């Protein structure tokens, strides 16, 4: 539903010309904010109050120092990747659920504990990084304040449908079989489901591949292997909020 | 840890010969975040190629969208070349037009 999430990444050995720290900020599935350590300025993305961006720049410069200081707490050579997810979700029950999770070299290892008001995790690397961050003045209070009060509030303040074009095509697979692929081109919102029917009976797992387009829309396809010469018994049903009701997609004629 | 990339190649709109369009290569699920990606035309790297910012998903794996405006023809063949530390050799994934 409604989320406001920040994606933070630091690398101890960034490839040449690339930032050591960068952040994206998301309202639901849409990115509205970016920041990187090379430029040092919070910036709007896509469609997106000057005091707000000055404030984001202030905070993310602080986060940047915090993340790079984590590598000093670990010591050694690494190289390291530190990731962080910070923000809010508004569930159907009306509760703000916060997220404050951290991954080290692709593995979750630390989170922010609302009760203790401090970062923590099971292993020495979590303790060592948490303790480095606690030495940063006001840093834990800023985190707690953000998760419990600022971010729910902003999510309310910070608070479109393009239906997909459908294609159901068959291609030879291997002798004895074809593969049907059902594709949804250029749609929004990203939620979308696809199912197959063989002569009116459900078939396949429903699983399919999803992907973004560079204009904010999305792409999806689902594939199923069927018996040769039995492709005409199949059709595809798509569910999407741009459609007033699920839509039957018949096999491409030629 | 290491996670090998998933590679998807698709057009923004249903492809029609002579009609402009966008070609996407979605590369996702990988760790660590260093990756080389190229779009190919008849086996050769395309140059005017944009890509989104490196970001990551809930499972912390990274993802990148590469894309370019193009006008497909009958004879022109498109693909995506991905290189990553988890790969002995780079992967080349064709834009499959019968899919």
């Amino acid at each position, epitope marked *: 539903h409604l989320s406001l999430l920040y994606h933070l990444t630091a690398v101890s050995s960034p490839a040449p010309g690339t930032p050591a720290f960068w952040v994206s900020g998301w309202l639901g599935p849409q990115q509205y904010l970016s920041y990187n350590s090379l430029r040092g300025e919070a910036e709007p993305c896509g469609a997106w109050v000057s005091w707000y961006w000055e404030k984001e720049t202030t905070d993310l410069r602080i986060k940047e120092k915090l993340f790079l200081e984590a590598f000093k707490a*670990l010591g*050694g*050579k690494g190289p390291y990747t530190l990731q962080g997810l910070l923000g809010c979700e508004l569930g159907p029950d009306n509760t703000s659920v916060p997220t404050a999770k951290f991954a080290l*070299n692709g593995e979750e290892f630390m989170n922010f504990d609302l009760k203790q008001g401090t970062w923590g995790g099971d*292993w*020495p*690397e979590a*303790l060592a990084i948490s303790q480095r961050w606690q030495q940063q003045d006001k840093a834990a209070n800023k985190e707690l304040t953000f998760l419990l009060f600022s971010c729910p509030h902003r999510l309310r303040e910070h608070l479109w449908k393009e239906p997909p074009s459908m294609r159901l095509k068959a291609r030879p697979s291997s002798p004895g079989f074809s593969v049907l692929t059902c594709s949804a081109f250029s749609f929004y919102p990203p939620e979308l489901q696809l199912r197959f029917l063989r002569n009116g009976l459900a078939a396949g797992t429903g699983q399919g591949d999803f992907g973004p387009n560079s204009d904010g829309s999305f792409h999806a396809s689902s594939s199923l292997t069927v018996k040769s010469g039995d492709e005409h018994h199949y059709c595809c049903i798509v569910q999407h909020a741009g459609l007033a009701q699920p839509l039957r997609v018949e096999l491409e004629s030629p | 840890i290491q996670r090998t990339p998933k590679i998807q190649v698709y057009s923004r709109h249903p492809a029609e010969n002579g009609k402009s369009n966008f070609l996407n290569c979605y590369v996702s699920g990988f760790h660590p975040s260093d990756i080389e990606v190229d779009l190919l035309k008849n086996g050769e790297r395309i140059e005017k190629v944009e890509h989104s910012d490196l970001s990551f998903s809930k499972d912390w794996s990274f993802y990148l969208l590469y894309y370019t405006e193009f006008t497909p023809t009958e004879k022109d063949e498109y693909a995506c070349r991905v290189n990553h530390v988890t790969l002995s050799q780079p992967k080349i994934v064709k834009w499959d037009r019968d899919m």
Partner: antibody
Amino acid sequence: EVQLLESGGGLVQPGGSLRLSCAASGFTFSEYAMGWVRQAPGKGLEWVSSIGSSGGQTKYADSVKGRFTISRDNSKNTLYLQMNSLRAEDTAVYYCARLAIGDSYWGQGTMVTVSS
Amino acid sequence: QSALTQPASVSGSPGQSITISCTGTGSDVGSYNLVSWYQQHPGKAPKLMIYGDSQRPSGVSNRFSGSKSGNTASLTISGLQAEDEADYYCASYAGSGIYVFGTGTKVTVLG
């Protein structure tokens, strides 16, 4: 002063079981992952097992997987090591260790002898 | 897992510098480790001399120093003294509670 106190070591017949305990004091126990390291007489150090600060995650050396269980009681400030299916090659001094980056407090060890 | 390798024995004269290697210390791309060195006197529990490849705990003489390159780590002891006669172990922390100890080197001070 950080203090770790092993106990529970003794003689055991092979195939028997034994439970080691480590009493901790002098630091916030529940913030630290804890581990066991052992040393057979005249031999080198061998990491045995680690448990995360909350008890939620455990790790074991291959020579010990399936037979040993590490556990902790954060209200009693105690680390444990449950050892089943003991073998002669488990004979060693067993050390309790506080896991940290930048320091390393150990107990003095408890002696386990596995012999018929 | 499986041990890191050290020479079983290294010896030097009083005031000499000596070096102990540790082999098997490399990490896969995407992973890391931190190398520690322990000193163990007879009867006593191991004592930490180096952490994080090259850091000394407060109180450890600066005669002790360490380094790590690729698949090896090294401990150097300068101005060797008879009190340094001990067993030395390297150790590798790979994160997530996993350690492995080297096989150990006995240091003998001659003369």
